[PDB]
Design a protein around this ligand. Structure first.
Ligand SMILES: [Zn+2]
Ligand SMILES: [Zn+2]
Lengths: 152, 152
C-alpha cells in the first residue's frame, strides 16, 4: 500500500511527500522533500477534506475522527492527522522522514482522499496554554497542500 | 458522502467536478464544469492512481479493478473508471451532469483518492475497431486532471 501527495500553495512552497504502509496495521512511513520553506520548524498535518476548491482553506481542520484535542504525534491525546513538525534547513529544504502509527492508508484512520498541509510556523504540539494550541497547535497559515492519492 | 475534484493541466483546461452518493449501495451523481476545451466530445475517466507527480501522466490507466475491456459508461463490459464523454459547447465549456452506478465513493469501486482526467479527443466508447479502443477508447492525451478528495 502506497500513497503520494504533491504540495502546492500560493507562495513558493512545493514538494512531493510519499506514504508507505507495508502492513495493514503497521506504521506508515512518510517521506519526501519540500522546498521554499523558511529555515526552522513547520506544522505538518493531515487535514479533514481533500477539497482544494478554495486552495488550502477548503481542506477544513486537522483530520480528527475521534474528536480529541490537538497534540504532538507521540501523545495519546491527538488528532489522527497530527504529524508534528518538519524541519527546513538553511537552504529552505525540509527532507521529511516521519514514521507514524496513528494515521493509516486503510480503515477508519485512512488519510487517502484527504489533504496534507505544511504550515507557516512551528506546531507547539498542544503545549502553548490556550485553546488555539489544543486546536491547531498555533502553527499558523497554510503554506502548501495537496490531496493524498493512491500510488504504486 | 461527497467528493470533489479540481482539474488542472499544462494548458488552459481547468474546472471543478463534484460527486455525491446518498446511499452506499446507490448511484453517484457527478457534476460541474470544465473550461478551455475545444468544442466537442472529450474522454472523461477515473484513472487508477491519484499520483500527480508527473502531471496527469503518472495517473496510470483507467481504473479497472475487475480487469475488463474499455467501454462506455452504460456498457456491461467496461472499466469502473469509464465515464464516457463530456461535451464542450461553442464557448469552450463543458457542463457535466452524470449519474453512474458502477463507480462508488466507498467500497471496492471507491474512486476517492484516484485521478479524474479529461481527455483531448472523444472516447469511442471502445467500439473503434483497433486494440487501443478497448484499452483507452482513443481519447488522446490528458489535458487536465486532479485527485479526487473527500468533501464536506
Ligand atoms: Zn491537530
Ligand atoms: Zn476505460
Amino acid at each position: 500500500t502506497k500513497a503520494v501527495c504533491v504540495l502546492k500553495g500560493d507562495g513558493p512552497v512545493q514538494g512531493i511527500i510519499n506514504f508507505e504502509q507495508k502492513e495493514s496495521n503497521g506504521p506508515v512511513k512518510v517521506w519526501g522533500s519540500i522546498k521554499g520553506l523558511t529555515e526552522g520548524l513547520h506544522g505538518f498535518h493531515v487535514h479533514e477534506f481533500g477539497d482544494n476548491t478554495a486552495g488550502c482553506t477548503s481542506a477544513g481542520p486537522h483530520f480528527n475522527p475521534l474528536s480529541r484535542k490537538h497534540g504532538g504525534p507521540k501523545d495519546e491525546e491527538r488528532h489522527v492527522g497530527d504529524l508534528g513538525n518538519v524541519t527546513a534547513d538553511k537552504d529552505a529544504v525540509a527532507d521529511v522522514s516521519i514514521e507514524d502509527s496513528v494515521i493509516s492508508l486503510s480503515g477508519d484512520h485512512c488519510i487517502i482522499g484527504r489533504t496534507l498541509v505544511v504550515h507557516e510556523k512551528a506546531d507547539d504540539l498542544g503545549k502553548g496554554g490556550n485553546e488555539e494550541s489544543t486546536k491547531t497547535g498555533n502553527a499558523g497559515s497554510r503554506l502548501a497542500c495537496g490531496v493524498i492519492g493512491i500510488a504504486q
